[PDB]
Structure formats: C-alpha cells, structure tokens
C-alpha cells in the first residue's frame, strides 16, 4: 500500500524534544512502545490528523532517553512514566481553587490528604531535588497543580483513589528533597544506662512522632531503653527551616500565632477525612474548596508544622 505520515515530537521530560514522523496506519505502541498524550494512554491508537505538531510522552527506550529521564526525575523505574501519566489523567481533571491565597484542591478521587499536603507544602521552606518536582512545585504555587499532584502520587507509589497518610506522604516527599542543612541532636537520659546523645540528619531531623507539642519535645518526652525505665528524651540542637510533629489523632487545641499549619483527621483508621488548619491573623480551616475561620481551635489534630531556623537548648 501507500504510507501516510505526520510529524510529532516525543519526549520523556518535556524539555528535550526529539522529532519523529509516524506511519498513520500503525499504532503508536508499535513505533515507540507505550506512548501518552497528556495522560491519555494512546499506545493502541493510530495517529490522527490533528495529532501532527503535538508532543507525546514515551518510555526511555534508549540510553539518551534514560539519561534525560533521570536528569529530570531522578528515577530509573521503567514504570514511573506510566504511573505518572496514569495519575496525570485524573489530576488534570481536578479543580485547584485559590483558597485563602493558597492553592487548594476541590475534592475528587479521595484527594483529601493530597490537598492538605499541597497546602502544607506551600507554607514550609523546601527544595525538591528532582527538577520535575521543583518545576511542578513552582507551577502549583501559581495555581496549576495538576502535574505536582500527579508527581506526588508517582513518587509516593500511591495511585488515584487510593487512601493515604499525610505524615507518610510528607516522609516520602522529604526523601526527594534537599534536607542536608538539617541536623537534630537528641539527648536521652536514663536512670540506669546513663546519658547518650544522637545526631539525626535528613528526614529524621525534621520529623518526630509521639507528641504534637514542639514545646513539649523541648521539655522532654518519655521513651523506654534497654531495661524498661521510661527515659527522658529532649531536643538539644535543631537547625532546619521547619519541623513536623505528629501523633495519633486526638483532641488538641491550636492558638493564634503559635504554629504554622496543622492536619485535622476525622473518622476511622484509613476511612477518615483530612482538613487543613493554617495559622494567620486568625485560624483558617481549609477543607478542599471550603473555607471557615475561627479564633480558637480544639479538635482532632494529628500533624502540626512549626517554623524553626536554629535552636539550642538552655537545659544543662
Ligand atoms: C489515611 C491512612 C492511610 C494509610 C495509613 N497507613 C494510615 C492512614 C491514617 O488514617 N492515618 C492516621 C493519620 C492515623 C495515624 C496514626 C494512628 C491512627 C490511629 C487511628 C486512626 C488514624 C491514625
Ligand atoms: Zn545508560
Ligand atoms: Zn478520577
Ligand atoms: Zn536505660
């Protein structure tokens, strides 16, 4: 027969585009392997007449594409582009209204934890290492958070509709973020074992679970040791742009100006709903696209984010 063709660009990072010309009789998958058009798995679709001139994502099918894929994503998972494109299929259809000067997400596909995670990220000082994450991190702040949410799902190994934790989401996100000007020096005192200090760097430096009160963490908290005496572990040195305090959900009161932002969890284990409290001239309860404000807050808090720059204790 006769061969018809159109001109289309393929890419893995949407920065370096490689030009291709494809037979319109054969499907995309035969010519490139799996192929996507803005999240549409067009692997089994023959090229159309309107497709000419557009840009499609392909898998890293040669080392030039593999290197470009790493330099933008810092991942070598062959599934990453497919998982990212599957997430982008749903996130591009979500709505991202500007609530209280922050880019929130209107509820859909069980994105409650992603919304309060998105709002939290807009208030803490964080540098993402993958250029895909930073670029999309940037574009979320401007109001276009479709790719950022899709990459968050991709990097956290979560899928659309699947339920997840904000505390476990931020942990994954902190792995893929530059936290090296970050150091926590814990010191533990036991009546029998004696005294020993630890130096935590990276994710463990900014995260702790057991109590929401960062002031209480400064006084000291109770932990066991090799014998069974509840020892006192207290913060000594903290150098990080922020700290995340966590604890299983319980009634907790928040005050005007004493914190940065919080995570509200209501309901059963896993089957609950997330809401975001942020500390402003007053307290704001951002629930997806919904917004209510109050001067006091006592409710089911599980994560509290505090601003820090550098801290050294006065406890001898
Ligand atoms: C939404 C979700 C998805 C996956 C996983 N693994 C957990 C959760 C989740 O609900 N976590 C919350 C915050 C939670 C944490 C710690 C103790 C809790 C006890 C009771 C109820 C909730 C508790
Ligand atoms: Zn190679
Ligand atoms: Zn959906
Ligand atoms: Zn001991």
Author numbering: 0 to 315
Q: What wording appears in the published article?
A:
SARS-CoV PLpro is a cysteine protease with multiple major functions, including processing of the viral polyprotein chain for viral protein maturation, dysregulating host inflammation responses through deubiquitylation, and impairing the host type I interferon antiviral immune responses by removing interferon stimulated gene 15 (ISG15) modifications. SARS-CoV-2 PLpro has two domains, i.e., the N-terminal UBL domain and the C-terminal USP domain. SARS-CoV-2 PLpro is capable of reversing the ISGylation and polyubiquitination (to a much lesser extent) of cellular substrates.
Therefore, we turned to grow co-crystals of SARS-CoV-2 PLproC111S in complex with GRL0617 by incubating the compound with the protein before setting up crystal trays. The obtained co-crystal diffracted at 3.2 Å. As shown in the 2Fo-Fc electron density map as well as in the difference Fo-Fc electron density map, GRL0617 resides in a pocket in the palm region of PLpro. GRL0617 is apart from the catalytical triad (including S111 in place of C111, H272, and D286) of PLpro with a minimum distance of 7.5 Å to S111 (from the methyl of the 4-Methylbenzenamine moiety of GRL0617 to the sidechain oxygen of S111). Specifically, the sidechain oxygen of Y268 forms a hydrogen bond with the amino group on the benzene ring of GRL0617, and another hydrogen bond of the backbone amino group of Q269 with the carbonyl oxygen of GRL0617. Other polar interactions include the hydrogen bonds between D164 and the amide NH of GRL0617, as well as between Y264 and the carbonyl oxygen of GRL0617. In addition, hydrophobic integration also contributed to the binding of GRL0617 to PLpro, e.g., the naphthalene group of GRL0617 is involved in the interactions with aromatic residues Y264 and Y268, and the hydrophobic sidechains of P247 and P248.
